[PDB]
């Protein structure tokens, strides 16, 4: 068929799947974020999110572009219309955002494999032979290499992931927390870290395996 | 006609009357407390005025502090506080009324609100509803039909405003609820 | 090495941010639901709304 029909078919539950409704909420929530949560006026929303929100929404659905991927997608949106219009444009509509997600996403559910490969490059094989990283080495590498992280940024991230902070980080203050995370860096993280541990920390989602045979 | 009468009384007093203006900055960029001198913009010209003291009646609003206290609550807030036409908030246990309150857009009547009516009729009917939860002597009553959710029911308790006016006039005005 | 590190950094940043958004969506969900009641997102506006 035509229009969204193929792309809807690519989404599990298409136009009514609980996934699809879950996504749609994020479009509104991020629209509020763009308005700001605190406003005295009438709320207003329409068709669009502003591109800085798009990385937020994409992460919120469950796909994890690099900063470079973010730059790529912003280039894609700005320039794609450019030569016909002459214009930059920065209001994106859901249908096209969906196309972007479906192209950019991993070609299935997210997979263990790159995690395993990353540990396998980085880590020693431990006493159990498992590819493993020592906690302070792991932290230092995550700051120093790849794309850099500020130490306080990394500490905030860990404290959030362990749930030491108040939640949402987007309306009420926190600063009583952060001193706890300093010791939590020892107390929360084990001395040897592995893909098994790290994925238990990141994922409640058992990202079960896909299937294909019906697909043309 | 009455407005013109008041304005002529203001003339006889020599009150300084300014349509169209908007508040440019008292003390401009200088420290604001106390005010001493003030500017007003207009469709054509600057204004300056000398202001020993400044009285506001510019806009009524929900209080910022309480507005924030509501938004912390995550009770639905659309710039004014959201209820069904039977006072339920998004909490079954919390209900609200009066001009600080407003109905879901589905009612398609964002112009029509508790602001429109008498105060007393609002409080009286709200209490009558809430009594039904408390009173054993009437039978306990169901939650509303969705058919009620279709509409804002036409109250009638007239809304009163009344005032004494420049040059020692009395004034009284009463209204059917309207846009 | 750097791409592996970026892979970890990506998964950390993604998880943190998604948790932020889902949490916020919970509190706002009532607000969000009423907003959807009022008007809808362009695709589901065009058909469904």
Curated annotation (Swiss-Prot), chain A:
It comes from Mus musculus (Mouse). WD repeats lie at residues 26-66, 86-126. It is found in: Cytoplasm, Cytoskeleton, Cilium axoneme; Cell projection, Cilium, Flagellum. Involved in spermatozoa motility. May also regulate cilium motility through its role in the assembly of the axonemal radial spokes. This is Cilia- and flagella-associated protein 251.
Swiss-Prot record, chain B:
Expressed in testis, brain and lung; the expression in testis is higher than that in other organs. Detected in spermatozoa in seminiferous tubules (at protein level). Not detected in the respiratory tract cilia. It is found in: Cytoplasm, Cytoskeleton, Flagellum axoneme. Disruption phenotype: CFAP61-null male mice are infertile. The epididymis contains fewer spermatozoa in the cauda and caput regions compared to wild-type animals, and spermatozoa exhibit short, bent, curled, thick or missing flagella, and are immobile. Acrosome morphology is normal. The length and motility of respiratory tract cilia is also normal. It comes from the Eukaryota. Involved in sperm flagellum assembly. Plays an essential role in the formation of the radial spokes in flagellum axoneme. Component of axonemal radial spokes, the protein complexes that link the outer microtubule doublets with the central pair of microtubules. Interacts with CFAP91/MAATS1, ODAD2/ARMC4, RSPH3A, ROPN1, ROPN1L and RSPH9. Interacts with DYNLT1, DYNC1I2 and TUBB3. Interacts with WDR35, IFT22 and IFT81. This is Cilia- and flagella-associated protein 61. It comes from Mus musculus. The chain holds residues 896 to 1074 of 1252 of the full protein.
Swiss-Prot record, chain C:
Expressed in the testis, in cells involved in spermatogenesis. Phosphorylated by PKA. It comes from the Eukaryota. It is found in: Cytoplasm; Mitochondrion; Cytoplasm, Cytoskeleton, Cilium axoneme. Belongs to the CFAP91 family. Involved in sperm flagellum axonemal organization and function. May regulate cilium motility through its role in the assembly of the axonemal radial spokes. Part of a complex containing MYCBP, AKAP1 and PRKAR2B. Interacts with MYCBP and AKAP1. Interacts with CFAP61. This is Cilia- and flagella-associated protein 91. It comes from Mus musculus. The gene is Cfap91. The chain holds residues 491 to 539 of 783 of the full protein.
């Amino acid at each position: 068929g035509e229009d969204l029909t193929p792309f809807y078919g690519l989404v599990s539950g298409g136009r009514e799947g609980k996934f699809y409704r879950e996504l749609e909420d994020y479009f509104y929530y991020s629209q509020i974020r763009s308005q700001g949560i605190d406003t005295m006026e009438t709320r207003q929303v329409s068709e669009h999110i502003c591109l800085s929100e798009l990385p937020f929404v994409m992460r919120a659905i469950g796909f994890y572009p690099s900063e470079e991927k973010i730059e790529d997608m912003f280039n894609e949106i700005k320039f794609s219309e450019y030569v016909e219009t002459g214009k930059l444009i920065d209001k994106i509509n859901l249908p096209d955002f969906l196309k972007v997600y479906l192209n950019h996403r991993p070609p299935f559910g997210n997979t263990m494999d790159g995690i395993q490969n990353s540990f396998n490059v980085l880590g020693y094989t431990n006493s159990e032979g498992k590819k493993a990283i020592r906690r302070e080495d792991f932290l230092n590498l995550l700051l120093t290499k790849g794309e850099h992280m500020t130490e306080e940024e990394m500490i905030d991230c860990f404290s959030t992931l362990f749930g030491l902070t108040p939640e949402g980080w987007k309306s009420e203050p926190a600063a009583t927390c952060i001193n706890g995370p300093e010791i939590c860096l020892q107390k929360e993280l084990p001395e040897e870290i592995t893909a098994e541990i790290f994925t238990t920390e990141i994922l409640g989602l058992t990202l079960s395996d896909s299937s294909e045979q019906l697909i043309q | 006609d009455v407005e013109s009468a008041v304005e002529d009384a203001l003339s006889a007093a020599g009150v300084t009357v300014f349509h169209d203006a908007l508040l440019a900055q008292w003390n401009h960029g200088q420290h604001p407390d106390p005010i001493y001198n003030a500017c007003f913009t207009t469709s054509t010209k600057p204004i300056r005025l000398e202001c020993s003291a400044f009285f506001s009646f510019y806009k009524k609003n929900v209080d910022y502090e309480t507005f924030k206290a509501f938004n912390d609550a995550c009770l639905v807030y659309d710039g004014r506080l959201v209820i069904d036409t039977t006072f339920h908030t998004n909490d079954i246990a919390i209900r609200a009324a009066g001009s600080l309150t407003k109905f879901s857009n589905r009612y398609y009547s964002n112009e029509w609100t508790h602001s429109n009516f008498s105060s007393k009729e609002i409080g009286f009917q709200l209490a009558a509803a809430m009594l039904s939860l408390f009173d054993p002597t009437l039978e306990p009553v169901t939650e509303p039909p969705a058919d009620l959710d279709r509409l804002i029911p036409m109250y009638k308790g007239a809304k009163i405003q009344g005032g004494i006016l420049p040059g020692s006039y009395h004034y009284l005005h009463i209204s059917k609820p309207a846009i | 090495i750097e791409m592996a590190v970026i892979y970890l950094q990506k998964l950390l940043r993604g998880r943190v941010v998604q948790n932020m958004m889902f949490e916020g969506k919970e509190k706002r969900l009532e607000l969000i639901l009423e907003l959807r009641t009022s008007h809808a997102l362009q695709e589901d506006d065009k058909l469904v709304k």
